[PDB]
Design a protein around this ligand. Sequence first.
Ligand code: TPP
Ligand code: TPP
Ligand code: MG
Ligand code: MG
Lengths: 545, 545
Amino acid sequence: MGMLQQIRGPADLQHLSQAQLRELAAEIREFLIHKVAATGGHLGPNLGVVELTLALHRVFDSPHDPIIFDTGHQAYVHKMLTGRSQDFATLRKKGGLSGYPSRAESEHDWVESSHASAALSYADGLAKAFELTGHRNRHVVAVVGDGALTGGMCWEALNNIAASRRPVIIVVNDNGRSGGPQLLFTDLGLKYVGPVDGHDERAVEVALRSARRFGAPVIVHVVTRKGMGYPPAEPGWTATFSDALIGYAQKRRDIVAITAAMPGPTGLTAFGQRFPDRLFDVGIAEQHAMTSAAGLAMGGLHPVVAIYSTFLNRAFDQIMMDVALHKLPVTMVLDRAGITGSDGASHNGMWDLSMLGIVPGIRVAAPRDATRLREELGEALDVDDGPTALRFPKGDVGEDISALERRGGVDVLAAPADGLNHDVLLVAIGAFAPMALAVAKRLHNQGIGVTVIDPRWVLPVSDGVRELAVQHKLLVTLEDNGVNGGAGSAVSAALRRAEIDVPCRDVGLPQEFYEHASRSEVLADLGLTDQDVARRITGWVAALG
Amino acid sequence: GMLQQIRGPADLQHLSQAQLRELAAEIREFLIHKVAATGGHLGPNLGVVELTLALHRVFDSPHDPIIFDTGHQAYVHKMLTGRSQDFATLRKKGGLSGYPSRAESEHDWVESSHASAALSYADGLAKAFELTGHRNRHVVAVVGDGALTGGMCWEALNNIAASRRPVIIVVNDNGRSGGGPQLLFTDLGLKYVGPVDGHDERAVEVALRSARRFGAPVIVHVVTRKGMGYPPAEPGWTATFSDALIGYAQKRRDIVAITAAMPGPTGLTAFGQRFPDRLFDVGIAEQHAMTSAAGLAMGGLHPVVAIYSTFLNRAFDQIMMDVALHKLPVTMVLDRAGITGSDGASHNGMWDLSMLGIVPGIRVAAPRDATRLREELGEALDVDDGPTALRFPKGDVGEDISALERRGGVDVLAAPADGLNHDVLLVAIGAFAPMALAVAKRLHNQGIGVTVIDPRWVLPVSDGVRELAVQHKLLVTLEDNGVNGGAGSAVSAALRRAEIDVPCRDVGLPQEFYEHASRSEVLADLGLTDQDVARRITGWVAALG
Ligand SMILES: Cc1ncc(C[n+]2csc(CCOP(=O)(O)OP(=O)(O)O)c2C)c(N)n1
Ligand SMILES: Cc1ncc(C[n+]2csc(CCOP(=O)(O)OP(=O)(O)O)c2C)c(N)n1
Ligand SMILES: [Mg+2]
Ligand SMILES: [Mg+2]
């Protein structure tokens, strides 16, 4: 990596020959292949933008010309050219290099959000700011994937950008042609340059220079190959969902599945292979996924919309006014619910119990294990008079956790030992059932008697939890979700509405954005461990009265 | 008297062009006579007389679904589907809805007033008809030029363009002879017909028949005149906001204002006249409004985004990942907060305190009166390290409500009379301060001592409300917002986090969609009156002593 080790920042590219840039691109690929996991590392999308990123830093003067990556998972080459190549040993590790652009890491980084299709909206705002503050000759460059370009925010932003001569350069990074828009963007009233071969570094520079000089908004359409230069790049909760859904759909022809551009990761690819007419991929279009789901339901079908928990924030108003307002039987399946960790603040699925709690009439399940995922999906598919949601975490599902009994839909997982009393009702939400059972055993050791329940259907709060609450002295909810408007607050609200003033505590994620770390590190750092939660509950029980 | 003879669409089928001219004139005089001058959408309905006649001359509703985007312009549709006699009750409790209603007519599909969704429903419905083998159902979406500036239209058109399934996109364009798209939609890869003279009933039928027989999706571009045939068509809270904002912006050149296509109704028109370079109208694009605000803030400005409470649902993920994640000083101003009444379930601003409570670090104010709106806006504009929001109702502002004292941010509006106990802390949110004071007077007469407080900054919950809560036997929050995740639930959560187990009660709007009625009728039907609330608090004070 002789030449790469000499690049201190973008201007070190400025007098390199085309032959030197060809050598450097080879070094960058070797570096990426060595430093980045071949699976789940975004190696492919980064290999795809080596020449594009060299060309951007040869034509634009960052950060005077902001270079804004849409989604930001493909910014590794950008970081390597902005003094951070030495930091890749720590990529996506706690206290290490972020997987996304980071304002704290570099003056060259603007947007930390992984949520796609936002770059052009930031670019419009920044271009307006530069005009209002009289900064001369700042060219805002948005790097927008073909996938990101299927998102409605890009249309809102392009409509606004097209109303002004303020220079926004729209660089379409298209690796969906040799997943992108069906619509043409050659004749929208915006100047269009290309298509450009995105692996011809000089061709990209020529196109970017024509865009820079045009003196008004311009689309530069560049075509890249995901994984360019590396042939390979060219029992899970998700697997349990995939198998369960196919099983239900074998018997019921009215079940259809919808993904916003993530058929593989949501486990819907296998569903499509069995029922290819019944799987819809709507692009990176969570809003359209939900409202087209409402349309399918108005036509007599029972859609299953699989969208990762964090991305469902985009569909809030569609869940409200298109699905819930019409009492339509849409099931939403939220994978990556709770802490995901390594992809940082904008990936953790920590909003969905708080957001869905606002929706009139909604029923929300949080599976504790594989059998409860299968069971709760079956129940969701039998709700024909309004929306349902299931939420479950990323990664492997542990062993089934058996109930001692079911009381009004509530699974009793543990009950106080004979000789101990009904001290604490521990309401274990979804994937925190193992933590709650460990807490109950630590409290048993202190002579504190704990009933652990899985409510299964967390919203609305069931008769089961009201009936058990009055038999205990303290209710503690334990949830892999933000505490503000979360399951704990919903349980307290339900008790108080029923004139039950048993003290309640809401144990979950503080209402904060978290830095990247492993799930176990994030939970350890917040004191969401059986040891720390048991110590807190010991303190609450001692303080009663 | 031809209109009296139209029992449904097929009664148009054998009318002469002269008869259609006469019927259009009767429809206009009917609309002018029956529809309220302000807030009745007379203009948009007068604009679609010939278009709606043409739709019901070419399409066979409901076999061919006719879906109105936003649905405020469906009055002619209702007059041609057996409901002309029902207009005496238009937008009255138990009367005709101002929007399409599935319960009123087999010809009505979508009840949501939230714009830009029609094409998403159309794609889903068209998919459903194919999956269920219904023959020859043409889904017609009537999409205003304004609605067409929304991102959902781009997502839907992208999906529709991938299939030959017959969706007919009727663009009802009254923005050209300017609230429609800047982008061209003549060359998107979809068949384009027009532009058509939208007041030439025959020419509109010719274009729609061309679309119906095409055998694939088609855009029909129809140009209409808003208020056609009525020259005139061709409040206090808001005015207080408008004046206050202009006053602050006089002294601070970094204040910018953003509207999603409602500069008049949000009170920003007057701001633009004073500061024309500092008002942005982004179209019907709440998502772009918030993320372009993030871009403006990243360029050193302090944006004020004025969006009606209910429509801010669309911007939830942008508030979260674009504004809040980057700790940017964007002030959101939510007019039409709380019950609005007459525009039905999809207009009531009853979600914002629950949705905004999810946002890490957010500060939310609810003005009780004009002076507190001025004060809290100034305080919002002085927050430089994260998002702020102000929410206030539709209509006229009453007299200022003076505080006895301010304690830890909190205004004490009433305290127990000398000789009464500190029985109830009544936490009056925003516009319910008058109701809270009336409740306190009634309970005073019963010998019940009430502290009424306006917390001013509802989120995060202030030291002031924790300090006063420990001094009372009962805490009751009274809020013009859904109870689920609302101010009352937040106050309870904050006390419990601080180890304060004073009984809390959440008095507000049940988490339900409300039928159209006046604001006073809705609040009376829910028991949100000083008489019914004082009665509930009497019952709680009795059970606690
Ligand atoms: C709102 C949202 N939904 C989904 C995703 C997940 N996502 C990341 S990349 C991608 C598909 C590819 O998009 P593109 O913009 O073409 O990027 P590239 O092909 O360069 O990886 C998706 C669905 C996201 N980041 N944001
Ligand atoms: C999401 C959303 N934002 C704002 C509005 C309020 N609204 C109603 S009509 C309109 C502007 C005009 O739109 P258009 O679709 O052109 O209808 P028309 O001109 O026929 O009234 C707006 C902003 C809304 N209904 N939905
Ligand atoms: Mg791509
Ligand atoms: Mg219009």
